[PDB]
Structures are given as C-alpha cells and as structure tokens.
C-alpha cells in the first residue's frame, strides 16, 4: 500500500524531533553509538512514540510484521544520511521495541493474540544456537533429471511431497544443497516461572525463535522478559533483568506484625503445621530460606549470602515433607533429585550442551549420599564459589550460582551409631562438609513423651477425614528479602545473626 509512504515520512520527521529532556535529541546519540560500535540494534521505547502518535502504536499492536517493514528502512536511511557508506558493511538494521505496557502470561496466550506484539515472562531452557535451518525446500529426484519447485518450509512440521514435475515415481527425494537457503536458528524452549503459577495447575511452555544477533546473550535458568510477535513466538527484544507480590495495603501491617511480641518463634511454629517436630530442623530451615546479605570490598572478596543446611538421621523420620512444604512456600524453590554437560538428544541424534540451573532461589536435594561424580563436583563448585562454568559444544560461559542448598541424607546402615563421629558415619569427607555450615541431626526417642505426641498427631491427621498464617508468612519472605540489607563458623554465625535481624526487620 501507499499508506506506508505517509507513515514513513511521519516517523522520519519524528526521530529528528524527539527532545524529552532539556531539549536534547537523544536519537542522535543513539545513532552515533550504533554507528561507531557497528551495532544493528536500535532502541525505541513504546511510550515515546505512543505519546507522539497513538495510531503508530495501534498499527504496531495490530500488524507488526508490516509495521516492521517501515522501521528498518527509515533506520537505514537515517544511518545512511548520518554516516556515509554504511550499507557496504551492514545491509539491514533492526529495531528493539521495548517498554510494552500489557505484560501477558503464558497461560493467556490465545487465538486472539495471533499476529501481534506480546511481552511475556519466563525461564529459558534447551539452548541450541547458530544453526541455519531450512526456509525454502527443494528436492533432488533420482528417477529424472529435474528438480522440484520451491516450497516454503512450514516451521513447525516437515512437508512430504510425492509428486514430481516429470512423472509419478516411487523414488525418494533428497534435499538439494545447491538451492536450499537456510535462515538462522535460536531454538529456545521458554517455560512459566514457578513463583507465580496458581496452585493445582501446571506451568506451560512455548518455543521461541531468536534471530539477527541476540544469540548467547541469554542465561539459562534465569527469569527473562521477551517482547515479540505471536504466530510459536518470534522474539524481537530480550531482557535478562527480569503475580504474588506485596502491596501498599499489606506492607504497613507487616511492620506492625514484626514490631510486636517476638515473631521469630512464631515463624518457627508456623514452619511445620503437619507435625510437632523440634525447633532444630526448622530454625536452620527458616534461617536458610530467609538468608543473609552478600558483601564485597572494592569489587572483590565476594562472600556467600546463602546458608546451606544438611539434615541427617534415621530414614523413618520426616525429612522430605519439610522440603516439600518449602517447595510450595518459598519463591523460586527447585526440588531436584544443576550440571552443565554435552548430552544426546533423541530427535535426529542432536548434540547440545545443557547448562546448570534458581539463581536467587533455594535448591532442595534429597538422598545426598546416593549420587555420582558429576553432580557432586558441580554442587561442590557451587558451594565453594558462586559460579558454574560451561566449556563445551562451542560455548564458554560462566553463569551465576548464588543458590541456597537444603540437602537431606541418610547414614550408612540406618542407625546413626552415636559412639562414632559424623565423618566416620557419613560417607562424605570434610571439605564437602565444611561448605554446609549447619548440620542438623535427629535421633531415636524411646520414651513416653515422643510416643504421647507423634502418634497422637499422626492419628489426629487420619481421624479428621496462635501461629502466623501461611499467606502472610510467604508474603513476608518476599517483602523482607527484596527491600532490606541490615549491616567459617564466625562467618556462619554473623550470617545467622543478620538473617535473624532480617526476620526481625531491624536496621541493624
């Protein structure tokens, strides 16, 4: 249409007039930074042109595929009159549409959101990169000396053609390498985050396409915000910076609850509603989930702000129910049973490297003594320092591993064997035990007291078909862990004291 010609000259006049702060045109600085550093990514906020012209925002929300045919052309024209001979090195320059107001979820992706712009949150997995998958398929025939016509490759499923231009044969058709063109590929499977999924439901997952240089800038196992078009999502912009959150009406009552009558013990009694228990497991559990603060001196000497606890005792007691309760309770809690290696993939014998994992979350390990060499060394590296390196399949990336570790184990033989130390009891050695600051251990109770309480509570749980409530407690965890910062055994007790000060919500 010729209507794009009156659209083009409108935004060509817009880029030379946007002066929002102190009369300065920021687009000239943006075009000189993309021209001097040879970049192809141009940044445009949605609010700027939306305040300028809402019809362009309506056209971008309705038909972004035809709206993107004007943007790249006017950006290359602005770069060509601002910089001479820029077309010799870079032929096309794309744009990055950011600041989308209506952030959607993965469960709200419906048929009405087709062929439109959408900003969705998620977690990235399955990293396969820099592969030129087919976009125009041709076929060599062996029964005749001809070729098949051009067929557009449907990106979700392969196409089988039996008819050829000369006859009707039974012979197979092969891919012609002299005519087939391949477009780039960034096949990433994105998933919904577990910290905002409703209870009872399962998190969905989609496939995202990444093209024209934004490959390997994303970190697997982290929260991400992607703005793209919906058709399979074709991402335009990625953001590695980022429904159950704190409000203004709930934040005043949290300080009012934290000020009166010693809430540390109430949080401890609110930790285990299913059983009576004892405070030694839940005190370590609450101080590990609430955590401490990470501090550095002049950019170096990074201390670990997480607390890794280790549970031990006979297998008849409860050790998995506490982590099963904290998997639902705490935010970004991952229950595993975190390594980066080259692994086989069954579809067409594919080869890729799977990176490790919850960067701010808590990972829960059950049956710690029953593992191999790779998952022991990876957790020892993540317990020693806070990063996991990937050095395979053509990629080298050192990712952040600042996660808390809650591990549960069993001794060799069932019995704890109290007339021997823990180093002779467990099969583990001392430097893997030194990363765990708190080592909680239970024992067997023969007496009338435990028999009077445990059996009565478990029969009260079966005969039926004061503390802080669960919702306020899980909202208080996210409210205290994201706003305040109150200023090896010595490092551990300072972390436990600052974690108790974090739970007490004090200034120091």
């Amino acid at each position: 249409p010729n209507v794009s010609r009156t659209i083009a000259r409108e935004l060509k006049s817009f880029l030379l007039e946007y002066t929002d702060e102190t009369g300065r045109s920021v687009y000239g600085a943006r075009i000189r930074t993309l021209g001097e550093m040879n970049s192809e990514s141009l940044e445009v906020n949605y609010r700027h042109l939306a305040e300028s012209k809402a019809i362009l925002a309506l056209f971008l929300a309705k038909c972004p595929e035809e709206m993107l045919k004007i943007f790249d052309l006017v950006a290359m024209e602005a770069t060509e009159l601002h910089y001479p001979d820029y077309a010799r090195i870079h032929s096309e320059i794309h744009v990055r549409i950011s600041d989308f107001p209506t952030i959607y979820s993965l469960r709200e992706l419906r048929e009405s959101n087709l062929s439109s712009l959408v900003r969705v949150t998620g977690v990235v997995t399955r990293r396969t990169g820099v592969f030129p998958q087919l976009k125009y398929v041709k076929f060599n025939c062996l029964k005749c000396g001809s070729i098949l016509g051009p067929f557009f490759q449907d990106s979700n499923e392969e196409i089988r053609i039996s008819f050829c231009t000369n006859c009707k044969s039974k012979g197979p058709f092969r891919v012609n390498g002299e005519k087939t063109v391949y477009r780039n590929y960034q096949r990433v499977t994105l998933q919904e985050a577990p910290g905002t999924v409703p209870p009872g439901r399962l998190p969905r997952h989609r496939e995202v396409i990444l093209l024209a240089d934004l490959v390997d800038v994303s970190k697997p196992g982290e929260e991400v915000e992607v703005t793209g078009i919906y058709k399979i999502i074709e991402a335009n912009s990625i953001k590695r910076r980022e429904v159950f959150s704190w409000t203004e009406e709930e934040e005043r009552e949290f300080r009012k609850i934290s000020r009166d009558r010693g809430i540390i013990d109430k949080i401890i009694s609110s930790m285990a509603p299913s059983i009576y228990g004892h405070r030694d497991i839940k005190t370590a559990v609450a101080c590990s989930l609430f955590g401490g603060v990470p501090k550095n001196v002049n950019g170096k000497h990074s201390i670990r702000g997480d607390i890794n606890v280790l549970l031990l005792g006979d297998p008849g007691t409860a050790k998995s129910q506490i982590l099963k309760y904290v998997e639902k309770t705490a935010h970004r809690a991952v229950f595993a049973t975190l390594t980066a290696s080259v692994r086989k993939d069954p579809i067409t014998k594919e080869w890729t490297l799977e990176g490790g994992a919850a960067d701010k979350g808590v990972c829960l390990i059950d049956e710690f003594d029953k593992m191999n060499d790779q998952d022991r060394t990876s957790i020892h590296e993540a317990m020693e320092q806070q990063s996991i390196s990937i050095s395979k399949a053509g990629i080298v990336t050192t990712l952040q591993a600042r996660c808390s570790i809650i591990a549960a184990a069993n001794p060799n033989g069932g019995r704890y064997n109290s007339t021997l130390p823990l180093a002779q009891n467990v099969s583990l050695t001392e430097p893997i035990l030194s990363r765990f600051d708190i080592l909680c251990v239970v024992r067997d109770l023969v007496d009338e007291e435990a028999d009077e309480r445990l059996a009565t509570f478990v029969v009260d749980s079966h005969v039926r078909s004061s503390p802080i409530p669960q919702e306020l407690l899980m909202k208080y965890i996210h409210y205290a862990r994201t706003k305040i910062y109150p200023k090896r055994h010595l490092e551990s007790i300072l972390r436990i004291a600052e974690s108790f000060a974090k739970m007490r919500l004090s200034e120091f």
Binding site: E111, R160, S320, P346, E448, D451, A455, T456, V459
Partner: protein, 564 residues
C-alpha cells in the same frame, strides 16, 4: 439432493437452539467472556425434537450436514452476540459400540467408541493458509484442509500461463492436532481373538484431556484414511436380588472368616497371606489432610520365602479374578517397559509414547513376580512412583505428569533361595533401604517336614488333579464377592477417639518389644509401621462394613503385624 436439505436442517438446528431458553443460550453467554467456542450438546437432549426423526436424519448424514450446523451456530451467535474458530461436540449416546462391530455401513455417521488408550503422540499444528503464486502477487484465502490442500482452482487475475500450480505460505493462516491409539477392552475380547487396535485423530480443545493408560469413551465420526478406516473424536471422558444378597451378607457375624478362606480357595494354609491379599484390594482415605497434599492411602504387599511354594498361585488368582489387575514377570521389563515406553522414529512420523504396565488399572493391584532380578532403574522408578503419587515423563522436549494410585504385589526370593533364620530381612532380601520402605506388610513363608499338614497338602494336591472338584470349593462364590468388594469400596469409614487412645498404647506396646530385643524382632519400628496399621484399620472397617471403628477390630491388625 442435500443442497436444499442442508438449509432446512440448518433452520431446524437453529430453531432447536433458538426456541430453548435446554441450557444452551446461557452456555453461550457464559463462554462470551472466555471465547473458546468448544460447546457441548447432548444427543439425548436433541433426541426429543421431531419425535427423534431430526436426530436420525442428522445421525447418518453428519459429515454432509456439519457445515450447515456450524453455520447455524455461527448465525445464532452472530445475532445473539457481537479470530473465529468453532467446535461442536456431541455426547451421551444411548448405545456403546465396540471396535469389533465397526462396518462400512457407518462411514461418515457418528459413533461411540469405548476402549483403552495404548499410545499417545505429540501435539502438532494443523494447517486448516494463504497461497502465493510465483508469477504475480495474487493471494487467496478460501482453503481446503482434508485432502487436495495444494491446488486451488481460481486466481483473481485470470491472465496467466499456468492456472493450476501455486506455492504455500506459513505466514498468513493453525491449531492443536493429536493422534492417539485406542484398543479393545480386556473384558470384551473374543475367545482366541486378538485385541485389535486402531488410531483415532482429535482436534479442537478435546486434546490433552485424555490421559494415557485409562479407559476412554469417544464420540465422533468414522472417517477413512488412505485405505484404512480411522476415527475422529470430539468428546473425551475418563470413564471407569443383588441388594437382597448384599443385605443378607452384611447382617451376619462370620463373613470375615469365610472371606479369609475364600479369597484363595486353591491354596492350603497361609491365612496371613490371604488376610493381606484380601485387605490389599481395598484401601483407605488418601486426602486426609488440612495442608492440601494427597497421602499414600494404599496397601503394599510383598511375599518372600523358599521356592516351589504356592505363593505364585495367589499371583495367578488376582489377575484371573480382579478386573483392575496387571501382571508382569519382572525380568521382561525395564524402566520404560513398566511405566511408559517410547518408539524411536518409526514409520516416518515422530516419537510416540506407549503406556506400559504402570499407571494402568488405577486403584487396583499391580503384581510384579520376581522383584529382585529387576534392575536399578525400574526399582528407583518404582520408588519415585511411591514417593509421590504422580509420575513425570520428560522426553523429546515435552514434560507430562499424571496421577497414579496402584497397590504393589511384589513376589521376591532370597539370594540363595533358602530362607535362613539367623539374620535380618535386609541382608537376605538384598535390596536397599528406600525401596525396602513404603511397604505395609511382609509375608515370610518357611517350609519343613511336618507330616500331619504335609499329607493333607499332598492329598489336596492329588485331589485337585481331577475334572472340576469340590475340594477347592469356597463357602460362597465370587458372584456376590465382586459386588461386596464394590459396596465396601464406596463406604468411606471414619475412625474414633477410643480407637486412637488404644492405638497410642498399642504403638507403645509394639515399640516396647524393640527394647532388649534381637529375639522375636527383625526390623526397625518408626512412623511407617504406624501408618501401615492405620491404613489396615480402615480396611478392616470397610471389610466389616462399620462406619465407626472399635479398637477390637484393630487388635486383629495388631496381631497380624505381630505375626509378621
């Protein structure tokens, strides 16, 4: 002849949908907010108009009347309400047809097919698609979808050298499509015949509602595939003097004593094994919580002892009597062989997941013979299936988890075969502690030379070897026992306070035997044995059909735990 009949049947269907305010108008008013358009119309509610004659005429020409029905539905939602896909589903047919009664006289008609799902495929985007020509910029939007999807017969500009061929596009058009495998049920297979299976296609939002390994009932249209006779379903559901005998059998007092000797009439002796097998069949409450998590309310039974015994006979009885019973040999299994096997790129298509022995026959007895010759992978898969009630399968990019509730009948043997008394159960069973756990009851059988019961056993063996003797005659048949099992299954009893007050003292009395033990003791006692006797209490409450349990019936379960 149906070109003028289609508008009349469209007018009749829209008159049926317009004159009834049936619950259809409020159903459209409810889906107005969500815009899914995957409606459900009952065939029993449609069978009253035109004395059923409107239903009989639609019932044979369903594929020839389907766009007229969707056009009438589109016109009534266009007039009663202001990106448009539609799915009309029919359900609740009065006749249930098998897979062996499908003929070619019902091609194109609607049909109700019941059976069991064997395999499931991945979801795929179906076409339903602008076509560009390589000579000019012409475009078309009227697309065909079943067959001949590449050649449209018209262009907007007829001046061309070749009006036949075009080129497809992937940009301007596309939803979920699935192909599953249905098979003949085990109770309606002919004598000597094979359980013939068939592939059924499914579209709309009827996909991912069918769980693999369950009895299912579909309603759809018989469509031929180049030929083969496939099926298209639109509705999915998870299906699956008598009271004078039942009320007479619940009023007496000696029912349980005939029940423990009538659950296995071919086996001489072993009343404890028969007690655990009879109490294994029916469980207790699994949702006994206030937090929101389901618990293990099932009974796990494991039999051990010396070889050449009659312990496999129970194994051959359960599977010949219980309808919800899957038997495996153990050695002819794996991790994927027991739960979910996968095909690997066969017949041109992608991977397909076939259902194994696990997750089949829910709330029934899965019986595994030779439990100790299995590998480590299937035993940790059994432990992962027993730690949590759901099971997760992560393969080819897709992740799928499902509910499972089965009771394990594990037949094991020692490392040397002969059971020696001088050591514990752990070193003789030869399996690790977490897979040795979550087992409610262990049955150890030892044999020796005791002539008085041995001569009776050998006489029973030689008296059984004849044409249908009364030597294995039970006091009552299985005819009332099946409905008694079902009547006790839908009972749901509730424990009492006096039983709990006696139970805490009984747990203290059972744990007092651990003190100065290593004589009349072979294993540890913790919360798991307490949970086993708690689960056996509601099972004996259901077997005696009492709503409120007394501790005297839990005393027999305490004696059963003391006998093991």
């Amino acid at each position: 002849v149906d070109d003028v009949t289609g508008e009349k049947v469209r007018e009749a269907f829209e008159q049926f949908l317009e004159d009834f305010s049936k619950v259809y108008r409020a159903q459209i008013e409810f889906m107005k907010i969500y815009d899914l358009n995957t409606i459900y119309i009952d065939y029993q509610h449609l069978s009253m108009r035109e004395n059923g004659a409107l239903a009989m005429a639609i019932s044979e020409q369903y594929y020839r009347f389907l766009p007229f029905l969707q056009k009438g539905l589109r016109r009534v939602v266009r007039k009663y309400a202001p990106e448009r896909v539609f799915q009309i589903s029919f359900f609740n047919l009065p006749t249930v047809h098998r897979i062996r009664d499908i003929r070619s006289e019902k091609i194109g008609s609607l049909l109700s097919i019941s059976g069991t799902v064997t395999r499931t495929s991945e979801v795929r985007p179906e076409l339903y698609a602008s076509f560009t020509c390589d000579m000019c910029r012409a475009i078309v939007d009227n697309v065909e979808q079943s067959f001949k999807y590449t050649e449209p017969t018209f262009c907007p500009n007829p001046s061309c050298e070749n009006r036949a061929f075009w080129t497809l596009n992937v940009t301007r058009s596309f939803l979920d499509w699935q192909k599953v495998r249905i098979q003949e049920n085990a109770n309606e297979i002919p004598t000597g015949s094979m359980p013939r299976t068939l592939d059924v296609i499914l579209r709309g939002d009827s996909v991912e509602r069918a769980k693999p390994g369950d009895r299912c009932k579909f309603t759809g249209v018989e469509i031929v595939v180049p030929y083969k006779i496939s099926f298209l379903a639109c509705h999915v559901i998870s299906i699956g003097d008598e009271i004078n005998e039942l009320k007479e059998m619940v009023k007496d007092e000696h029912i349980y004593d005939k029940l423990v000797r009538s659950i296995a009439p071919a086996v001489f002796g072993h009343e404890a094994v028969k007690k655990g097998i009879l109490l294994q069949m029916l469980g207790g409450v699994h949702k006994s919580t206030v937090e929101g998590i389901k618990l293990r309310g099932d009974i796990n039974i494991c039999v051990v002892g010396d070889p050449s015994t009659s312990k496999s006979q129970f194994l051959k009885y359960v599977v010949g009597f219980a309808p919800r019973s899957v038997y495996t040999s153990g050695k002819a299994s794996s991790a994927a062989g027991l739960t979910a096997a996968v095909v690997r790129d066969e017949e041109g298509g992608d991977y397909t997941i076939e259902a194994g022995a696990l997750m089949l026959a829910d709330n029934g007895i899965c019986c595994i013979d030779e439990f100790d010759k299995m590998d480590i992978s299937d035993q940790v898969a059994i432990h992962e299936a027993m730690e949590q009630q759901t099971i997760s399968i992560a393969k080819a990019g897709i992740h799928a988890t499902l509910n499972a509730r089965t009771s394990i009948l594990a037949a094991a043997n020692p490392v040397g075969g002969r059971y020696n008394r001088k050591l514990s159960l752990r070193g003789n069973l030869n399996m690790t502690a977490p897979i040795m756990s979550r087992f409610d009851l262990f049955f150890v059988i030892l044999d020796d030379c005791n002539e008085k019961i041995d001569t009776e056993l050998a006489s029973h063996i030689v008296d059984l070897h004849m044409k249908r003797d009364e030597a294995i005659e039970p006091p009552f048949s299985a005819e009332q026992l099946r409905r008694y099992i079902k009547y006790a299954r839908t009972f749901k009893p509730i424990l009492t306070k006096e039983a709990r007050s006696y139970l805490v003292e009984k747990y203290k009395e059972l744990r007092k035997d651990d003190a100065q033990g290593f004589s009349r003791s072979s294993y540890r006692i913790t919360v798991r044995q307490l949970e086993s006797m708690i689960r056996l209490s509601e099972a004996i409450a259901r077997a005696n059909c009492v709503d409120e349990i007394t501790p005297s019936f839990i005393a027999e379960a305490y004696d059963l735990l003391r006998q093991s």
